[PDB]
């Protein structure tokens, strides 16, 4: 149930790093994407090219934003009177700074 001794430096290290099962393997199965000449996984789509195509689809197949007439044709002063500004909470501010906590996809290296 309980360790009888302080496990030594040797014995913890040979346990962890000695076996190949536990080690990380080289990703030999990279290959060139045909659409953009960059690294991608074998038997896998290029995340750049499919992303680009998804973006294209979004730009074309776009549901139009609903802008109400009455709010679109308000005067500036009138709009300010109706819908004044406010102090956002700390939480709200944190939520707004998305680049702080949201990871955008990185581009791979160009294949040789």
């Amino acid at each position: 149930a309980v360790p009888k001794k302080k496990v030594s430096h040797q014995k913890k290290r040979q346990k962890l790093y000695g076996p190949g099962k536990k080690q990380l393997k080289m990703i030999h199965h990279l290959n060139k994407c045909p659409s953009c000449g960059h690294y991608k996984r074998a038997n896998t789509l290029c995340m750049y090219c499919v992303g680009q195509i998804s973006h294209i689809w979004k730009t074309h197949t776009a549901k139009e934003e609903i802008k109400p007439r009455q709010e679109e044709e308000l005067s500036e002063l009138d709009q300010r009177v109706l819908y004044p500004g406010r102090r956002d909470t700390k939480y709200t501010k944190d939520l707004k700074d998305k680049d702080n906590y949201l990871e955008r996809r990185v581009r791979t290296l160009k294949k040789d």
């Binding site: 953009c36 896998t44 789509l45 195509i53 294209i56 689809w57 197949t61």
Partner: protein, 229 residues
């Protein structure tokens, strides 16, 4: 009960409902991204549904047709955005696949998602129309788009097309009128070139497309095999 399908870490009732939802979403949006295991199971359902619809369309037996219809109805959630999904299935989706013997979907593997390391895939409908009757482009048929992008890249590099690319193009063609296929390719080029910001001289692009079509369509050792002494 064991081995017939993926369990997907869900109770039976939930699992089936999930699969139905995935099928509905595939029919609505002609491609969808999801986890690999879910996509694989969803394909099985969607394909089955398509075949049933085809059978209903074709069969002379009225009772059979009614039974197929009932089965199709059972296998979908018809509400909200999928109210007129049955109609779409009979009129829009299933008529694409009348000549095609199975294989109506394609699950294309993606790079696994970063937060979760979950293997990610794209379940999508085969031979989805890239251009509707309105002057727009349609959401779906990712593989075709990728192929055309690869072709464009090859043209830019002034390289020959890869054998695999040609094989894929041939596969795409098999259930496609040649002129229609060409027109689709041309349409894809217009969007793709603009996105990538390469110049679109139209006549030259058309000629290239024609050349690509021609080679696709017109079909043309270490050990020796010797009889026993």
């Amino acid at each position: 009960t064991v081995g017939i399908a993926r369990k997907l870490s869900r109770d039976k009732a939930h699992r089936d409902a999930l699969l139905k939802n995935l099928a509905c979403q595939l029919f609505q949006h002609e491609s969808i991204v999801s986890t690999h295991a879910k996509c694989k199971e969803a394909s099985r359902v969607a394909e089955r549904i398509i075949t049933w619809t085809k059978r209903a369309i074709t069969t002379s037996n009225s009772v059979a047709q009614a039974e197929l219809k009932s089965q199709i109805q059972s296998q979908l959630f018809l509400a909200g955005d999928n109210r007129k999904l049955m109609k779409r299935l009979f009129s829009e989706i299933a008529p694409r696949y009348l000549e095609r013997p199975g294989g109506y979907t394609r699950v294309l593997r993606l790079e696994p998602r970063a937060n979760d390391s979950a293997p990610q895939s794209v379940l999508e409908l085969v031979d989805s129309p890239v251009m509707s009757e309105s002057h727009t482009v349609n959401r779906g048929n990712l593989k075709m788009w990728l192929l055309v992008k690869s072709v464009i890249n090859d043209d830019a590099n002034q390289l020959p097309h890869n054998p695999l690319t040609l094989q894929n193009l041939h596969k795409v063609a098999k259930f496609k009128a040649e002129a229609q296929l060409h027109g689709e390719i041309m349409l894809i080029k217009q969007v793709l070139l603009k996105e990538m910001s390469l110049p679109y001289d139209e006549a030259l692009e058309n000629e290239r497309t024609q050349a690509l079509l021609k080679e696709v369509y017109s079909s043309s050792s270490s050990y020796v095999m010797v009889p026993r002494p």
